[PDB]
Amino acid sequence: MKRTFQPSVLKRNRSHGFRARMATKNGRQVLARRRAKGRARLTVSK
Amino acid sequence: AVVKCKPTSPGRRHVVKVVNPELHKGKPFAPLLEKNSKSGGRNNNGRITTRHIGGGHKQAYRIVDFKRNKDGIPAVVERLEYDPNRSANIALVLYKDGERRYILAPKGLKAGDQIQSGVDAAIKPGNTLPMRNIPVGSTVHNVEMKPGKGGQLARSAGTYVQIVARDGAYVTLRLRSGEMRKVEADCRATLGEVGNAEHMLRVLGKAGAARWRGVRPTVRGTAMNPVDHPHGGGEGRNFGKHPVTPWGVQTKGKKTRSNKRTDKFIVRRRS
RNA sequence: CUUUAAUGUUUGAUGUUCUAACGUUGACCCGUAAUCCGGGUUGCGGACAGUGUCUGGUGGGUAGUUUGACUGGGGCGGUCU
RNA sequence: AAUUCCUUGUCGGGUAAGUUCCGACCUGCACGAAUGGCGUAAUGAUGGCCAGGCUGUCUCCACCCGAGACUCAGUGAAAUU
RNA sequence: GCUCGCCGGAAGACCAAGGGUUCCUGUCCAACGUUAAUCGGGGCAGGGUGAGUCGACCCCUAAGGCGAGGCCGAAAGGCGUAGUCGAUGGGAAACAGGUUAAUAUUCCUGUACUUGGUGUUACUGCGAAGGGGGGACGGAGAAGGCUAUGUUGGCCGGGCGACGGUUGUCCCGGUUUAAGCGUGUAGGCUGGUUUUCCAGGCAAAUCCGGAAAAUCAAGGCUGAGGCGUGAUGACGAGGCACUACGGUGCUGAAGCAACAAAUGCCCUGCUUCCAGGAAAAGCCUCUAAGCAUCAGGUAACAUCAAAUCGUACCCCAAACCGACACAGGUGGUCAGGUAGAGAAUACCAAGGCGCUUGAGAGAACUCGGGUGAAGGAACUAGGCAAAAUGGUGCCGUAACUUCGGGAGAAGGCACGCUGAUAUGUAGGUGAGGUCCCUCGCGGAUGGAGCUGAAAUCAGUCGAAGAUACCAGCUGGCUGCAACUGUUUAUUAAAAACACAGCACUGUGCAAACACGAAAGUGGACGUAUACGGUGUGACGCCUGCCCGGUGCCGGAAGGUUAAUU
RNA sequence: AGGACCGAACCGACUAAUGUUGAAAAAUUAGCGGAUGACUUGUGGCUGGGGGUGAAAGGCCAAUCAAACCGGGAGAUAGCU
RNA sequence: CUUACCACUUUGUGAUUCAUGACUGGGGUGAAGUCGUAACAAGGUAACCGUAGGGGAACCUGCGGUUGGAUCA
Ligand SMILES: [Mg+2]
Ligand SMILES: [Mg+2]
Ligand SMILES: [Mg+2]
Ligand SMILES: [Mg+2]
Ligand SMILES: [Mg+2]
Ligand SMILES: [Mg+2]
Ligand SMILES: [Mg+2]
Ligand SMILES: [Mg+2]
Ligand SMILES: [Mg+2]
Ligand SMILES: [Mg+2]
Ligand SMILES: [Mg+2]
Ligand SMILES: [Mg+2]
Ligand SMILES: [Mg+2]
Ligand SMILES: [Mg+2]
Ligand SMILES: [Mg+2]
Ligand SMILES: [Mg+2]
Ligand SMILES: [Mg+2]
Ligand SMILES: [Mg+2]
Ligand SMILES: [Mg+2]
Ligand SMILES: [Mg+2]
Ligand SMILES: [Mg+2]
Ligand SMILES: [Mg+2]
Ligand SMILES: [Mg+2]
Ligand SMILES: [Mg+2]
Ligand SMILES: [Mg+2]
Ligand SMILES: [Mg+2]
Ligand SMILES: [Mg+2]
Ligand SMILES: [Mg+2]
Ligand SMILES: [Mg+2]
Ligand SMILES: [Mg+2]
Ligand SMILES: [Mg+2]
Ligand SMILES: [Mg+2]
Ligand SMILES: [Mg+2]
Ligand SMILES: [Mg+2]
Ligand SMILES: [Mg+2]
Ligand SMILES: [Mg+2]
Ligand SMILES: [Mg+2]
Ligand SMILES: [Mg+2]
Ligand SMILES: [Mg+2]
Ligand SMILES: [Mg+2]
Ligand SMILES: [Mg+2]
Ligand SMILES: [Mg+2]
Ligand SMILES: [Mg+2]
């Protein structure tokens, strides 16, 4: 029946968006961790 | 009056409501309201602190005003307004000064009637007066904890407190809880028994009421798994355990009361 | 000087009243076209309350574990030198 | 009896015949009064028993209309080993 | 292209969300379509979305989030004041035709509109982050009025009919047309106004709140639709010229009336009810500091400005969530004809389709269904499943009962069509003409025309007339749970949970308790007729005896007992 | 008026059949329950793991739940295969 | 031929009576068996009425009332 994935641009962003993952310590630590690992797209490109 | 209700439904059989026809039927004095916001029982962390809470109706906060001062200025009871916030029956006042406030409206909710509240005033049901002035053995009303706190006693319907001793600068009264309490004496406390009182005759009838009343259902202990409640029980009812709140504490004894920074005031413990 | 008494006297006991730490989720002022906060005034309470270190009690609310083996399957019973 | 082991207890009822059911008895292995006792109108995709109607559920299957199965053309799996 | 079948409160159309060139044209068919494939949402090229008025920005806030200083915490950080963000909600404005292979309240034509700056003219007190008013708000129900729009006649255009009949007294098609502008009406709310005084609205206020006198009553706000203008315009069946054969120019008749409706609008209404039903800005008004022929403010008009992004397409699906061109999931809008209570259903309109393997054969067996002699639950764990029952009105209906129910109990009768009553009745609707008037979206009286039940008589065809789809099986005894509800997403819906009622017990407010090392906060902007916890679980009748053990409440005299000295 | 009655949409899942390498990692068909309410739903927010949430079944917390997932401790330990 | 009324007769469901039944309520009779002794005298606690609870059984206790209570109370 109903699936487990009801999209919503806004949510998808503020939930795992740059600023968001940039408004907290670890969250911000995350990005770094990513850039370090050398990832193409950082967080939900757009 | 109360009046039961013709059993027309498998739930509308016990619906014994209560009514006060003299209660104004219309939107309240707008310039004395202000949101309300539903807490749902959550905390700042967004975590539920106290169970049983939620749903309910929109509800808009009145204003009441337990402070009540404007000493030396009269005012006639405009109307009698039903209050969603509390159980009592708020009543619009309106002083001859032009400014109109709210009140819990006591037993003598006689509409149209006039009432003052000055320091002098006159022992009459519905008049702000510091017990230091009012007589003794009076029915009082909205008693005030501290001198200018704002009154926090007998603010419910039917409530009432009777003075007893004005020894020194501290007056001793008797809360409806049957407890002997002392106050700074130099405290105001309207007058007359709080209005309504016949409130304690409700009944609701069907869950609906309690539900749309903001009161959520409650789950018993010896009905849920152990990991959830100390009364885990399970497997053919059972119990044996000691009746304790969901946190190991005999829900029978233990006063739990441990203020101490008040004893002085408290004279004859509640009984 | 020993046994026992009065005012001095210092020290432990309870018990009073005071204020000046301390509290105040009473009222007012100022920071201010702020019910947060801070300073001030006043009222109330007052060495209590609370807190810190040590400390007796309580404490499946929580936590780490233990809870044997021979057994004509294991258990029960019995046994273990 | 959602509690009765001996149990298909015994007796009455319904049956052509009833280890179920209904009404009783009391000998309650081992009900019992807010981990409520006994009744209760209305309510229930709730448990058990009965009757009428109804019928392919059956006696005892037959026929029939279509979807596959079968034959041809095309594409073309799997488990196992 | 002609037939045939399917959907049509969708399997049509439009928008959101999500998607991201899937849109159109051209081309090519390896790989991709469960095969082929000249075809496509496949490949490759180009082409393709035009706004002052639709939307987002923006203004305003909700929940909630962030947060100077600040209050706390080993650190990181928690919280939260001013404030600042944040819609799903409140703020101003454009319609009607036409056009493209693909755009469209954007482009074109016609006709309007919103607001700011600047200027002219008349008039006048202007001025806030500040006061007030308003914005601004619930449930259910009961009409009436109106539009949508349908049916029917009139009108206009076409047609005399492959087979018996069809000049009208018949058949087919059309009959449309907006914003804005004026009128302000069916109705809805409300009495105005001048003056005086004031402990209120933190200061002020002429505004709002209060108190006073006088004066007139026919005062003022709101309001669907209708009616004219829009619009001698457009559109419009229908034609003739060209064609690419899909399309292109030109031309262009009538274009009314009656009745019937809404789940739309009047209606943020009206009636009523208890569970008592956002905020903020825009808006109008009132003054502060201040300005003081100034500046400003109001109205008319001239003009300039209205920036920037989003507009393609799918959107109940082959573009979205399900690995697929997957029988599943997906919010909102529109609402045709006959029958019908009706958004069920049946057949059809507009519109969209035949679900991407076909062709034959006509075995057992599986699947889905139709029909069955006689029997009728013998089946079987159990009537599982099937078969049956079904509509409207009227007659009639048990024990029991909390007097509401039970109850559609049960069980029955009549139902089609045709003539009559009655040339279409009852009823609904409402045109003349006449009267009077403030004087017309006036009132009255008049009842043409339009539409139109059911009933009761008599007649009549079939085996049968609630003929299809659709649409209860019923009754008796007994356990359990009062009841509606909830629950093991994906084997359990129950006798389980929940409940309304009940009892014990804690809590005097900085409440008890819960979240939190803390601050802070829920409890509650409550206050013992309140809140928390625990057990019981409507209601009726009741709820006996035991305090030895355990726990709990109270006492503290004595015995024992920590740190400390 | 009513957690009132019948019944669509809507929400929910009582029974049976079919599917069980499905059309599908819970569905399709025929019946079925509620349907003005403790209803149902769009949109966005808050609760975080020994924690939340729970009309309580150990249910749910992204097809995972008697302690989610991701990374690390970490080549855990494995008298056993 | 057909229609109307209509007897027989059929079906469904209510009311009444008689009869009858596992079992059970008490009621009446004789043996007068067992447990007591309640009431009749002040009946050895004056009795009775109503009423409520309790109990092997008469009956006891609470509440009001009656005198149809003996002693001079
Ligand atoms: Mg359980
Ligand atoms: Mg526990
Ligand atoms: Mg369990
Ligand atoms: Mg179990
Ligand atoms: Mg443990
Ligand atoms: Mg260990
Ligand atoms: Mg061993
Ligand atoms: Mg029995
Ligand atoms: Mg029991
Ligand atoms: Mg139910
Ligand atoms: Mg082949
Ligand atoms: Mg492409
Ligand atoms: Mg295309
Ligand atoms: Mg293509
Ligand atoms: Mg803003
Ligand atoms: Mg913060
Ligand atoms: Mg919005
Ligand atoms: Mg002919
Ligand atoms: Mg588009
Ligand atoms: Mg298009
Ligand atoms: Mg396909
Ligand atoms: Mg196919
Ligand atoms: Mg047969
Ligand atoms: Mg049988
Ligand atoms: Mg058999
Ligand atoms: Mg069946
Ligand atoms: Mg059937
Ligand atoms: Mg039984
Ligand atoms: Mg139930
Ligand atoms: Mg399940
Ligand atoms: Mg199930
Ligand atoms: Mg229970
Ligand atoms: Mg029970
Ligand atoms: Mg008891
Ligand atoms: Mg209902
Ligand atoms: Mg229904
Ligand atoms: Mg179904
Ligand atoms: Mg899951
Ligand atoms: Mg290691
Ligand atoms: Mg390893
Ligand atoms: Mg005697
Ligand atoms: Mg005697
Ligand atoms: Mg007596």
PDB file of C-alpha atoms (C1' of nucleotides) in Angstrom, chain E residues 285-396:
ATOM      1  C1'   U E 285     -10.186  57.329  13.165  1.00  0.00           C
ATOM      2  C1'   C E 286      -7.472  59.992  17.796  1.00  0.00           C
ATOM      3  C1'   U E 287      -4.139  62.744  19.480  1.00  0.00           C
ATOM      4  C1'   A E 288       2.445  63.111  21.025  1.00  0.00           C
ATOM      5  C1'   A E 289       7.356  65.466  19.928  1.00  0.00           C
ATOM      6  C1'   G E 290       7.188  68.513  16.139  1.00  0.00           C
ATOM      7  C1'   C E 291       5.443  72.019  11.622  1.00  0.00           C
ATOM      8  C1'   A E 292       3.185  76.391  11.934  1.00  0.00           C
ATOM      9  C1'   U E 293       0.456  81.135   4.665  1.00  0.00           C
ATOM     10  C1'   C E 294       5.093  75.990   5.019  1.00  0.00           C
ATOM     11  C1'   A E 295       5.004  70.976   5.347  1.00  0.00           C
ATOM     12  C1'   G E 296       1.494  67.769   4.880  1.00  0.00           C
ATOM     13  C1'   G E 297      -3.794  65.609   4.376  1.00  0.00           C
ATOM     14  C1'   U E 298      -8.817  64.786   0.987  1.00  0.00           C
ATOM     15  C1'   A E 299     -11.106  64.636  -3.981  1.00  0.00           C
ATOM     16  C1'   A E 300     -10.861  65.397  -9.602  1.00  0.00           C
ATOM     17  C1'   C E 301      -7.701  64.814 -13.494  1.00  0.00           C
ATOM     18  C1'   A E 302      -2.443  64.630 -16.687  1.00  0.00           C
ATOM     19  C1'   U E 303       1.367  61.821 -16.693  1.00  0.00           C
ATOM     20  C1'   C E 304       5.360  58.301 -15.289  1.00  0.00           C
ATOM     21  C1'   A E 305       6.258  53.658 -12.499  1.00  0.00           C
ATOM     22  C1'   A E 306       4.570  48.642 -11.315  1.00  0.00           C
ATOM     23  C1'   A E 307      11.239  45.648 -10.564  1.00  0.00           C
ATOM     24  C1'   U E 308      12.744  40.458 -10.545  1.00  0.00           C
ATOM     25  C1'   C E 309      11.900  35.018 -10.785  1.00  0.00           C
ATOM     26  C1'   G E 310       7.721  31.150 -11.849  1.00  0.00           C
ATOM     27  C1'   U E 311       4.758  29.986 -16.242  1.00  0.00           C
ATOM     28  C1'   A E 312       6.414  24.073 -21.416  1.00  0.00           C
ATOM     29  C1'   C E 313       4.178  19.146 -20.025  1.00  0.00           C
ATOM     30  C1'   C E 314       2.286  14.586 -16.546  1.00  0.00           C
ATOM     31  C1'   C E 315      -0.775  15.389 -12.361  1.00  0.00           C
ATOM     32  C1'   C E 316      -5.231   9.861  -9.456  1.00  0.00           C
ATOM     33  C1'   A E 317      -0.556   8.759 -13.632  1.00  0.00           C
ATOM     34  C1'   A E 318       3.617   4.781 -18.652  1.00  0.00           C
ATOM     35  C1'   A E 319       6.497  11.857 -16.252  1.00  0.00           C
ATOM     36  C1'   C E 320       4.732  11.846  -8.693  1.00  0.00           C
ATOM     37  C1'   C E 321       5.779   7.561  -3.973  1.00  0.00           C
ATOM     38  C1'   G E 322       6.053   2.006  -5.036  1.00  0.00           C
ATOM     39  C1'   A E 323      13.450  -1.410  -8.423  1.00  0.00           C
ATOM     40  C1'   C E 324       9.441  -2.064 -13.912  1.00  0.00           C
ATOM     41  C1'   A E 325       5.725   1.653 -19.556  1.00  0.00           C
ATOM     42  C1'   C E 326       3.922  -2.547 -11.988  1.00  0.00           C
ATOM     43  C1'   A E 327      -4.126  -4.231 -11.339  1.00  0.00           C
ATOM     44  C1'   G E 328      -1.360  -0.634  -4.996  1.00  0.00           C
ATOM     45  C1'   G E 329      -0.827   4.925  -2.580  1.00  0.00           C
ATOM     46  C1'   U E 330      -1.770  10.365  -3.987  1.00  0.00           C
ATOM     47  C1'   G E 331      -4.616  16.408  -1.660  1.00  0.00           C
ATOM     48  C1'   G E 332      -8.295  20.067  -4.098  1.00  0.00           C
ATOM     49  C1'   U E 333     -11.842  22.112  -8.302  1.00  0.00           C
ATOM     50  C1'   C E 334     -15.856  21.394 -12.199  1.00  0.00           C
ATOM     51  C1'   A E 335     -20.437  18.722 -12.154  1.00  0.00           C
ATOM     52  C1'   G E 336     -24.637  17.286 -18.777  1.00  0.00           C
ATOM     53  C1'   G E 337     -29.500  13.827 -20.560  1.00  0.00           C
ATOM     54  C1'   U E 338     -33.289   9.728 -19.236  1.00  0.00           C
ATOM     55  C1'   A E 339     -34.510   6.844 -15.177  1.00  0.00           C
ATOM     56  C1'   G E 340     -33.575   7.466  -9.833  1.00  0.00           C
ATOM     57  C1'   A E 341     -34.248   9.559  -3.050  1.00  0.00           C
ATOM     58  C1'   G E 342     -29.309  10.283  -4.596  1.00  0.00           C
ATOM     59  C1'   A E 343     -22.303  12.370  -5.999  1.00  0.00           C
ATOM     60  C1'   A E 344     -25.130   4.288  -5.609  1.00  0.00           C
ATOM     61  C1'   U E 345     -26.498   2.327 -10.141  1.00  0.00           C
ATOM     62  C1'   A E 346     -27.945   1.490 -15.484  1.00  0.00           C
ATOM     63  C1'   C E 347     -27.682   3.309 -20.401  1.00  0.00           C
ATOM     64  C1'   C E 348     -25.717   7.544 -23.035  1.00  0.00           C
ATOM     65  C1'   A E 349     -23.205  13.910 -24.027  1.00  0.00           C
ATOM     66  C1'   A E 350     -18.698  16.675 -24.222  1.00  0.00           C
ATOM     67  C1'   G E 351     -14.305  14.219 -23.736  1.00  0.00           C
ATOM     68  C1'   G E 352     -10.863   9.987 -23.253  1.00  0.00           C
ATOM     69  C1'   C E 353     -10.190   4.905 -24.609  1.00  0.00           C
ATOM     70  C1'   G E 354      -9.810  -1.059 -26.492  1.00  0.00           C
ATOM     71  C1'   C E 355      -5.394  -1.910 -20.868  1.00  0.00           C
ATOM     72  C1'   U E 356       1.960  -3.704 -26.128  1.00  0.00           C
ATOM     73  C1'   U E 357       2.413 -10.752 -27.746  1.00  0.00           C
ATOM     74  C1'   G E 358      -1.081 -12.566 -31.669  1.00  0.00           C
ATOM     75  C1'   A E 359      -3.380 -16.938 -34.553  1.00  0.00           C
ATOM     76  C1'   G E 360      -6.002 -21.464 -33.797  1.00  0.00           C
ATOM     77  C1'   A E 361      -7.929 -25.733 -31.273  1.00  0.00           C
ATOM     78  C1'   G E 362     -12.263 -26.424 -28.049  1.00  0.00           C
ATOM     79  C1'   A E 363      -8.585 -32.537 -23.496  1.00  0.00           C
ATOM     80  C1'   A E 364      -8.041 -33.793 -18.020  1.00  0.00           C
ATOM     81  C1'   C E 365      -7.491 -30.444 -14.556  1.00  0.00           C
ATOM     82  C1'   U E 366      -7.340 -25.210 -12.003  1.00  0.00           C
ATOM     83  C1'   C E 367      -9.994 -20.263 -12.235  1.00  0.00           C
ATOM     84  C1'   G E 368     -14.718 -16.966 -12.713  1.00  0.00           C
ATOM     85  C1'   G E 369     -19.417 -17.581 -13.556  1.00  0.00           C
ATOM     86  C1'   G E 370     -24.938 -19.420 -15.853  1.00  0.00           C
ATOM     87  C1'   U E 371     -28.468 -23.560 -15.387  1.00  0.00           C
ATOM     88  C1'   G E 372     -30.109 -27.903 -12.992  1.00  0.00           C
ATOM     89  C1'   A E 373     -34.774 -33.761 -11.961  1.00  0.00           C
ATOM     90  C1'   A E 374     -36.019 -35.903  -6.715  1.00  0.00           C
ATOM     91  C1'   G E 375     -34.285 -34.900  -2.088  1.00  0.00           C
ATOM     92  C1'   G E 376     -33.171 -30.593   1.276  1.00  0.00           C
ATOM     93  C1'   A E 377     -27.737 -29.486   5.815  1.00  0.00           C
ATOM     94  C1'   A E 378     -27.962 -36.230   5.102  1.00  0.00           C
ATOM     95  C1'   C E 379     -22.399 -31.765   4.005  1.00  0.00           C
ATOM     96  C1'   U E 380     -19.267 -30.252   7.687  1.00  0.00           C
ATOM     97  C1'   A E 381     -15.210 -28.398  13.157  1.00  0.00           C
ATOM     98  C1'   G E 382     -18.985 -25.249  12.181  1.00  0.00           C
ATOM     99  C1'   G E 383     -24.417 -24.107   6.801  1.00  0.00           C
ATOM    100  C1'   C E 384     -17.435 -22.236   5.485  1.00  0.00           C
ATOM    101  C1'   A E 385     -19.148 -21.033   0.818  1.00  0.00           C
ATOM    102  C1'   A E 386     -22.982 -20.596  -1.769  1.00  0.00           C
ATOM    103  C1'   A E 387     -28.778 -19.933  -2.549  1.00  0.00           C
ATOM    104  C1'   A E 388     -32.137 -16.640  -0.325  1.00  0.00           C
ATOM    105  C1'   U E 389     -33.880 -11.609   1.594  1.00  0.00           C
ATOM    106  C1'   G E 390     -34.458  -6.837  -0.330  1.00  0.00           C
ATOM    107  C1'   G E 391     -38.316  -0.703  -2.815  1.00  0.00           C
ATOM    108  C1'   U E 392     -42.666   2.814  -1.576  1.00  0.00           C
ATOM    109  C1'   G E 393     -47.173   3.536   0.830  1.00  0.00           C
ATOM    110  C1'   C E 394     -50.819   1.356   4.011  1.00  0.00           C
ATOM    111  C1'   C E 395     -52.609  -2.608   7.665  1.00  0.00           C
ATOM    112  C1'   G E 396     -50.278  -4.876  11.607  1.00  0.00           C
TER     113        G E 396
END
